[PDB]
Amino acid sequence: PIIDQGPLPTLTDGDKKAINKIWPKIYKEYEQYSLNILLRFLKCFPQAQASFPKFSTKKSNLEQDPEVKHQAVVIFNKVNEIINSMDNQEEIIKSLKDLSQKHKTVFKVDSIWFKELSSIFVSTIDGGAEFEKLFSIICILLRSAY
Ligand code: HEM
Fold first, then answer.
1. Which of 42, 52, 111, 120 to mutate to test the pocket of ligand 1 (most atoms within 8 A of CB)?
2. Binding positions for heme b?
């Protein structure tokens, strides 16, 4: 499944091929997708809500929260940008290695959260083993500054 520790996995030509088949259908509605992913994460993991100073209101207005939607799309886009550069595995490493640093020293986020949001991301878009490896690479790197 999704992993967040250990030797970085390598994306096969096959994995990359499969991912690029499912992806467009997803970003064809990145707004309705990015939202459900973030909303299901906060509903099933309410304790994670305290990590976003940008918001901490009553969950009754959490789907209209403009800032909620803004963070939703921010995540979806990074994932998109990582898929756009799957071939150059040196670029991905450099990029996500630095983002891990922001989350640690700047946003003061707990590393145990990435895998969980990642689990919901995949399930919502229905990605297979391919996407689990992608997010395995994503989560391992996001926890590298820790
Ligand atoms: C799939 C994994 C994730 C990706 C791809 C991702 C990506 C990003 C990106 C692109 C930013 C923008 C940073 C900047 O502008 O310099 C960000 C900020 C942030 N992320 Fe994540 N993130 C992920 C998971 C999480 C999780 C699980 C949490 C914690 C519950 C988290 C908490 C934050 C916070 C609090 C900020 C600061 C937002 C702000 O104040 O504007 N992230 N993230």
1. 52
2. 71, 103
